[PDB]
Paper text:
The protease plays a crucial role in viral replication by cleaving the polyprotein into individual nonstructural proteins. HuNoV proteases are cysteine proteases structurally similar to picornavirus 3C-like proteases with a chymotrypsin-like fold. Their active site features a catalytic triad with histidine-30 (H30) as the catalytic base, cysteine-139 (C139) as the catalytic nucleophile, and glutamic acid-54 (E54) as an acidic residue which orients and stabilizes the conformation of H30 (15). The substrate binding pockets S1 to S4 in the HuNoV protease, which accommodates the P1 to P4 residues of the substrate, are in the cavity between the BII-CII loop (beta strands BII and CII, residue 102–117) and the DII, EII, and FII beta strands of the second beta-barrel.
To understand the role of R112 in ligand interaction, we determined the crystal structures of the R112A mutant of GII-Pros complexed with rupintrivir as well as enzyme and inhibition kinetics. In GII.4-Pro HOV R112A, the rupintrivir-bound protease backbone shows the moderately open BII-CII loop position seen in rupintrivir-bound protease structures from other GI and GII strains, indicating that this is the most stable rupintrivir-bound conformation for HuNoV proteases. Surprisingly, there is little change in backbone conformation between the respective rupintrivir-bound WT and R112A proteases of all GII strains. Our structures of GII R112A proteases in complex with rupintrivir further show no significant changes in the protease backbone between rupintrivir-bound WT and R112A proteases. However, our assays with R112A mutants of GII-Pro reveal that the R112A mutation does not significantly increase the potency of rupintrivir against GII-Pros. However, we observed that the R112A mutants of GII-Pro are enzymatically less efficient than their respective WT, and surprisingly, the R112A mutation in these proteases has minimal effect on rupintrivir inhibition. As a result, we observe no changes in rupintrivir potency against the protease. These results imply that with its flexible sidechain, R112 may displace bound ligands, including cleaved products and inhibitors, by acting on P2-equivalent moieties positioned in the S2 pocket.
Numbering used by the authors: 1 to 122, 132 to 174
Amino acid sequence: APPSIWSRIVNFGSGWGFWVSPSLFITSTHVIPQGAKEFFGVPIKQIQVHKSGEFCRLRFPKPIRTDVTGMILEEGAPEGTVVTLLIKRSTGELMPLAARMGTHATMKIQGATVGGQMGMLLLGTTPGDCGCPYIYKRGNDYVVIGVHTAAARGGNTVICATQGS
Ligand SMILES: CCOC(=O)CC[C@H](C[C@@H]1CCNC1=O)NC(=O)[C@@H](CC(=O)[C@@H](NC(=O)c1cc(C)on1)C(C)C)Cc1ccc(F)cc1
């Protein structure tokens, strides 16, 4: 993926988050810090936080990342679409993993219900990777489809948290 997209991925709590636009920031519910009084200098009360299972969306009252453009955000990718899971590691190493996305579904993961899309990695995902984006290109427009939330032990299945309607 291009550098402009990688720069949108920043460390966030126990995982990562993705600047969809200067004002919109998506991450995993499992990683958002629950005791924080602010994110990126903005008092938490001024941030509009939305939550759809494991998809956590933060709308900021003013542009924060003015250097980025507004990307397309969609609920998953068409079934069979090969996407790239942009994993950043704590070291700073970039570890783009290719995945073929599959069934959209409401899934039960460890008792909890998760809205998202199953994928298959095509050297895998690890505990610190949640919140990293699933990205693919459609023509000339890059598209983010969700954020990493889970991966099935004993197989290549990974779970991409998506946002509902
Ligand atoms: C906040 C502290 O924990 C973390 O590090 C959070 C991020 C890690 C990243 C995983 C960590 C490893 N490889 C990865 O990519 N995620 C999880 O652990 C998730 C659970 C799994 O990955 C499990 N997968 C499934 O249950 C699962 C079921 C199906 C189907 O697919 N995966 C186990 C492999 C750990 C946490 C979770 C629990 C309930 C939910 F509603 C939704 C999510």
